């Protein structure tokens, strides 16, 4: 009833098509949009699922010259004698009503978000199951998107496990630190992460204008002397900050902070960026946190009078993150892999003791959210 | 005179340090910023050039307890007995005056831009020279940044040349189309670029939320039947559009357009994004164009009444690009490589004739602007 055509007609000087569906709901489709989206072989390359029609070929003042229909299709003639057919189900999906557009956006981008604090139950799946079964890999990426973190247990205690997960997703995101990288204490460390020091809450790689969307960390070796993990839900924290200190939120969401990374690893590098620590979309919603206190530059590109208020705001944000109601602490064992949203979560590590042998070794990698989302879309289709 | 300290003192309840330089100019440094940027080994990891000091350790209401100085250094005691030394040259560079901050930003990000239209003289360098000499690679990337395109002549007519340029920069940007990819007519083409068809002005890969910053295209084989290249300076075009049709500019700079790419190449993919075609920074300056008419989705997530005005605006933008005063046309020969800013330029190709043998073959790749800028910073240092 809902996707069967009861009537189709051209309206508004023939600039709109109206469909009355068999449930009595109506949908409206601008003529210019219909013409732009003609699925014929002249206009559309089926092997690519892509538009061949050029903007230059589109008459933006076009109207429908003739229309007939049956229950499942509309058949249109255009003023220049071009001819198009549209399927009812295809039309129904693309209905310009707010409800229809919103449903479809939800299907494309999986916006469902579950905020959490210290009560978090760490979502956990088996490593080999995720590699082997689409049902398990689907639960993995869907939960990663919704909650922001999934622990995978039962991987080996040798290098190469993150690279498997990389292939399962698609491919990993190369940076100056390598295709994958080893978190261990290193002589002449090129990064604070490669020491035994504490890492306070941070996101990885704000020195890039497009920080890694997803991070993977695999525990090869763990130390008993410290090195526990800590995470916080940055979107939850930002919401709390906006309520408790709107001025602190305003400053952190509007001030461009410079980040820097200079050194040598996979290649020699001298990297500089600017980010707002709390990054909002055009509707004021938080979409990314960009903050690593190690790589925040000494250079600070703001008028003098804005400096101390910035630091006061940063301090409030960091104190919120550290609150016992916000943070979740846990410890990785060998064979554990954590995979998390590096745009939303902030993560940290407790200091541990240095010594002559390597007491602690994680292998890590990054993936682009678009690569992850692509796999998520494909997995959903295969599982449903 | 300019970087020699004549006087240093604590002011404003000791919350600011003022330096009077030997040229009689004054600079001001907030105490909290000084403390945050203590270069001692407790606060700062020299091997990493990174801050160890945590936000949690920073008293945002800190003032200077004591200060002495000589011509080249200031020596500060803090209320908790921490002790810091700062060098005059380091201070001078980081002066919070608008002039000093702006100079430094120019040094970090190379903002100099030369807009062009059909009068463009295509900047051209030798391929092997760029691989061999830092002077030539510096001219390459600096010109790429400033003008938006450089042609390199005298490469071979075999695959593997873009990969050399990749290593010269650092590394290339992997996508679903491969580490590098072959632009040729293909049976069951997964993309319109892999056909003999015309490509209208576009940017590459708006189906990604972070499109490739820099594109490389190397001509292995060229056809006499068509396949000329065309480019336009998108920042120049946007400026013209803002003047001729502010409403068209407003629409294209505020409307989120959906892009899509589904298929199989390096991996299987189902990619979706949203972009504003004219993407502005927080000051209203154009920073990226996101537009490929082939990969613009059939899905269009806007209220019905906004649809036809969007298309009318797009048409005006495309007509401007196509204007004889804006576009620059040229033809690649075997051994030519073009390298260009895929955020600023739009590029295209003329159709050519299909046949039984391959008549036309380019090898292409992408690089991230941050990777390119890093090399540019290093090269400038080595050359100066
Ligand atoms: C590359 C992995 N590593 C060193 C753990 N982190 C890089 C990101 C960062 O320093 O912010
Ligand atoms: C990957 C290279 N290729 C096919 C030439 N272009 C991809 C970007 C695009 O379709 O917009
Ligand atoms: O070592 C850990 O537990 C966590 N490491 C990091 O956050 C890092 O390397 O960026
Ligand atoms: O084939 C050409 O001349 C140019 N190709 C493209 O713009 C492309 O493949 O994206
Ligand atoms: N069911 C209607 C089919 C119309 C075909 C028209 C071809 N020009
Ligand atoms: N030139 C002044 C040196 C001061 C050293 C102080 C160490 N606490
Ligand atoms: Zn139906
Ligand atoms: Zn058609
Ligand atoms: Zn980290
Ligand atoms: Zn290298
Ligand atoms: Zn000096
Ligand atoms: Zn110190
Ligand atoms: Zn292209
Ligand atoms: Zn694959």
Give the CATH topology of the largest domain in chain A: Double-stranded beta-helix
Tell me the radius of gyration of chain A.
26 Å
Largest sheet strand order of chain A: 9-10-20-13-22-11
* Secondary structure: helix percent of chain A: 25-40%
CATH class of the largest domain in chain A: Alpha Beta
Bound heterogens, unique: 3-(1-Ethyl-1,1-dimethylhydrazin-1-ium-2-yl)propanoic acid, N-oxalylglycine, hexane-1,6-diamine, zinc ion
| Tally of DSSP helical segments of chain A | 10
Characterize the overall form of chain A: elongated
Q: Kindly give the count of domains of chain A.
A: 2
CATH superfamily annotation of the largest domain in chain A: Clavaminate synthase-like
Strand proportion of chain A = 25-35%
CATH architecture of the largest domain in chain A: 4-Layer Sandwich
Question: Biggest sheet of chain A: strands, sense, closure?
Answer: 6 strands, mixed
Tell me which oligomeric state these chains represent.
homodimer
Number of distinct beta strands of chain A: 22
* C-alpha termini separation of chain A: 23 Å
Overall SS class of chain A: alpha+beta
Short structural description:
The structure is a homodimer of 384-residue chains. Chain A is of the alpha+beta class and 384 residues long.
What would you say this structure looks like, in words?
With about 375 residues, chain A is of the alpha+beta class. Chain A has two domains: about 1-95, NE0471 N-terminal domain-like, CATH 3.30.2020.30; about 100-384, Clavaminate synthase-like (Double-stranded beta-helix), CATH 3.60.130.10. Helix content of chain A is about 25%, strand content about 30%. Chain A contains ten helices and 22 strands. In chain A, strands 9-10-20-13-22-11 form a six-stranded mixed sheet. In chain A, strands 12-21-14-19 form a four-stranded antiparallel sheet. In chain A, a hairpin with a 5-residue loop joins strand 7 (about 75) and strand 8 (about 85). In chain A, helix 7 (about 235-245) crosses helix 8 (about 245-250), helix 7 (about 235-245) crosses helix 9 and helix 8 (about 245-250) packs across helix 9 (about 305-320). The longest helix of chain A is centred in the C-terminal third of the chain and has 16 residues, at about 305-320. Chains A and B meet through strand 3, helix 1, strand 5, helix 3 and strand 15 of A and strand 3, helix 1, strand 5, helix 3 and strand 15 of B. The structure holds 3-(1-Ethyl-1,1-dimethylhydrazin-1-ium-2-yl)propanoic acid (2 copies), N-oxalylglycine (2 copies), hexane-1,6-diamine (2 copies) and zinc ion (ZN) (8 copies). One zinc ion (ZN) binds near residues 3, 88 and 89 of chain A. One zinc ion binds near residues 193, 202 and 347 of chain A. Chains A, B: It catalyses: 4-(trimethylamino)butanoate + 2-oxoglutarate + O2 = carnitine + succinate + CO2. Chains A, B: InterPro entries: AlphaKG_dependent_hydroxylases, GBBH-like, GBBH-like_N, GBBH-like_N_sf, TauD-like_sf, TauD/TfdA-like. Chains A, B: Pathway: Amine and polyamine biosynthesis; carnitine biosynthesis. Chains A, B: One of its GO terms (cellular component) is mitochondrion. Chains A, B: It is an enzyme of class 1 (oxidoreductase).
């Amino acid at each position: 009833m809902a996707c069967t055509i009861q009537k189709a007609e051209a309206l508004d000087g023939a600039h709109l098509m109206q469909i009355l569906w068999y449930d009595e709901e109506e949908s409206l489709y601008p003529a210019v949009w219909l013409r732009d989206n003609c699925p014929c072989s002249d206009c559309y390359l089926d092997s690519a699922k892509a538009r061949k029609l050029l903007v230059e070929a589109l008459d933006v003042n076009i109207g429908i010259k003739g229309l007939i229909f049956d229950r499942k299709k509309v058949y249109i003639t255009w003023p220049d004698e071009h001819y198009s057919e549209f399927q009812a189900d295809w039309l129904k999906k693309r209905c310009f009503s707010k409800q229809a557009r919103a449903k479809l956006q939800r299907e494309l981008f999986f916006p469902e978000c579950q905020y959490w604090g210290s009560e978090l139950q760490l979502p956990t799946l088996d490593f080999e199951d995720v590699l082997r079964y689409d049902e398990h890999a689907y639960k993995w990426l869907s939960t990663l998107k919704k909650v922001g973190i999934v622990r995978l247990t039962g991987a080996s205690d040798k290098p190469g496990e993150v690279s498997k997960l990389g292939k399962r997703m698609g491919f990993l995101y190369l940076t100056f630190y390598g295709h994958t990288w080893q978190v261990q204490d290193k002589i002449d460390a090129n990064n604070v992460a490669y020491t035994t020091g504490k890492l306070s809450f941070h996101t990885d790689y704000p020195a890039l204008h497009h920080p890694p969307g997803v991070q993977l960390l695999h525990c090869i070796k763990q130390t008993v002397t410290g090195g526990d993990s800590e995470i916080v839900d940055g979107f939850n924290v930002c919401q709390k900050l906006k309520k408790n200190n709107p001025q602190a939120f305003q400053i952190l969401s509007s001030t461009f902070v410079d980040f820097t990374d200079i050194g040598v690893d996979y290649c020699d590098f001298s990297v500089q960026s600017k980010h707002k620590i709390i990054e909002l979309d055009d509707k004021g919603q938080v979409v990314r946190i960009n903050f690593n206190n190690a790589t925040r530059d000494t250079i600070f590109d703001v008028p003098v009078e804005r400096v101390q208020p910035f630091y006061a705001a940063l301090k409030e944000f960091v104190d919120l993150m550290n609150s016992k109601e916000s943070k979740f602490t846990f410890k990785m064992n060998p064979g554990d892999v954590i995979t998390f949203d590096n745009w939303r979560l902030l993560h940290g590590r407790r200091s541990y003791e240095a010594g002559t042998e390597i007491s602690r070794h994680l292998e890590g990698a990054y993936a682009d959210w678009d690569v992850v989302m692509s796999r998520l879309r494909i997995l959903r289709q295969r599982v449903e």
